[PDB]
């Protein structure tokens, strides 16, 4: 039950290059073991054992090897893997990236010790997400509606307001017509980014349930690996072991994988595309697939991880591999941000795979599954027409395609553009969406059958 043998302390380091320390004469080393390094000046550093071979054990310290001696340093082998102290009072506080309190606070009293790697959920007892989360944004709730227990990222870039729409969907998260415990992982963020999220959660009075984990850019990069691992094992505790609906926000997920590339390139592992490791898909999926809901529990966990694609490329290894694991994405664009749309959400590369089970008669109403496909189709044709009037001329188009011009200037300004604090309901969104389909004739709406055109298009 409990490890009661005294821990051993070794002064037997034999090699240190990069972030790896090589300890010799260790007696029965253990994979994934956590250790504690005592520097010759007295500062303490932690480390995970990443390879053991006979008597040798290769550890990697989290804070870097700058100053690690050969004769005078002493490493103490904690006999167990990395387990964090998790509790119910681990909520309402702000912590650093590693494990420690920030707001002049105590350490947590540890209701139990959970392994931060967790263990995967049996797919036989994992129930499919059905109920819909109303986020108050028409580009989210109308066209790419998320469910409670859905993993769905925000595909952003540098400079775009992804943090502003991150705080917006936290204030306005509610069920479609007992609050969401938000766990927040801030990874590689600026100081003004961490002050924005701190002063937003301390503004709406939600800070009695916020679990904010902040990890700034001055903090070391190897601690960015365990930062979503600790932020998701408390959300696993609050949802599967404390019966509570949890919303997890991961940012920046690009700063996770760029920190993951540094450790892989230091271990001389095999690279994939653009220097990222070959096991990047697995490491991204061990923090993405820890979401959803299980059958015997009434709590759930939904994930909205924010990542900024480098150089606006959706074929980069960051948004491609997260697009293969998650359940559809949200694409905040740059060309819609220059036109001062506050959510600059290009809905064409946006998707929600669990949106179909979350819409319908019992969920919102009858026409949700049909107006979303028609607003998608008229935006797709009218944007290809927009690339034709820029190359030929604004006057020599087909007469139907001038309505596609009039649709797009009303789509990007009335449907998606709503303001930082306006929270439309899902019934308000479909009512605005039918107003934009009103400018089209009845027989050009091809994706809608003739039955529900009779109930909604004459109005």
């Amino acid at each position: 039950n409990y490890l009661s043998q005294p821990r051993l302390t070794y002064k037997t380091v034999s090699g240190v290059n990069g972030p790896l320390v090589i300890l010799d004469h260790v007696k029965f080393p253990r994979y994934a073991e956590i250790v504690h390094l005592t520097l010759p000046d007295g500062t303490k550093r932690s480390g995970q054992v990443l390879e053991v071979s006979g008597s040798k054990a290769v550890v990697q310290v989290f804070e870097g090897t700058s100053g690690i001696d050969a004769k005078k340093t002493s490493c103490e082998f904690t006999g167990d893997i990395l387990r964090t102290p998790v509790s119910e009072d681990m909520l309402g506080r702000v912590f650093n990236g590693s494990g420690k309190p920030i707001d002049r606070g105590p350490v947590v009293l540890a209701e139990d010790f959970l392994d931060i790697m967790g263990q995967p959920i049996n797919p036989q007892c994992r129930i499919y997400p059905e109920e819909m989360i109303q986020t108050g944004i028409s580009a989210i709730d109308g066209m790419n509606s998320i469910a409670r227990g859905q993993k769905i990222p925000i595909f952003s870039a540098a400079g775009l307001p992804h943090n502003e729409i991150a705080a917006q969907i936290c204030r306005q998260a509610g069920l479609v017509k007992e609050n969401f415990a938000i766990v927040f992982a801030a990874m590689g963020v600026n100081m003004e980014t961490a002050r924005f999220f701190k002063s937003d959660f301390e503004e709406n009075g939600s800070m009695d349930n916020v679990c904010l984990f902040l990890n700034l850019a001055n903090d070391p990069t190897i601690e960015r690996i365990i930062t979503p691992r600790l932020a998701l094992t408390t959300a696993e505790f609050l949802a599967y072991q404390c019966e509570k609906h949890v919303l997890v926000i991961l940012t920046d997920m690009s700063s996770y994988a760029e920190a993951l590339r540094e450790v892989s390139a230091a271990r001389e592992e095999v690279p994939g595309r653009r220097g990222f490791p070959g096991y990047m898909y697995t490491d991204l999926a061990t923090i993405y697939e820890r979401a959803g809901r299980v059958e015997g529990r009434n709590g759930s966990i939904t994930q909205i991880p924010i990542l900024t694609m480098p150089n606006d490329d959706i074929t980069h290894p960051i948004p491609d591999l997260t697009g293969y694991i998650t359940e559809g994405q949200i694409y905040v664009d740059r060309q819609l941000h220059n036109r001062q749309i506050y959510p600059p959400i290009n809905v064409l590369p946006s998707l929600s795979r669990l949106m179909k089970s979350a819409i319908g008669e019992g969920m919102t109403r009858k026409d949700h599954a049909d107006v979303s496909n028609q607003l998608y189709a008229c935006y797709a044709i009218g944007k290809d027409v927009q690339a034709m009037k820029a190359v030929v001329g604004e006057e020599a188009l087909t007469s139907d395609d001038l309505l596609y011009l009039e649709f797009l200037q009303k789509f990007e300004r009335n449907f998606i553009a709503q303001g930082p604090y306006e929270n439309r309901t899902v019934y308000e969104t479909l009512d605005i969406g039918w107003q934009l389909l009103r400018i089209f004739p009845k027989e050009m709406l091809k994706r809608i059958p003739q039955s529900t055109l009779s109930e909604f298009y004459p109005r």
């Binding site: 690279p271 595309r273 653009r274 220097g275 690339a387 820029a390 190359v391 030929v392 001329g393």
Partner: protein, 49 residues
């Protein structure tokens, strides 16, 4: 004489204005994002080597 020269010029300066913009919007950006694909795929062979 100036009427029949005016009416055949703008219908021959529309077909020149399209041939410029078809280069500027359809041909030149297609070559340039092809050339960006040559650079990153050649950098990916250098890491493999």
């Amino acid at each position: 004489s100036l009427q029949t020269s005016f009416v055949t010029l703008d219908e021959a300066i529309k077909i020149t204005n399209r041939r410029v913009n078809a280069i500027e919007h359809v041909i030149i950006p297609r070559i340039e994002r092809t050339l960006a694909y040559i650079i990153t795929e050649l950098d990916e062979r250098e890491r493999e080597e």
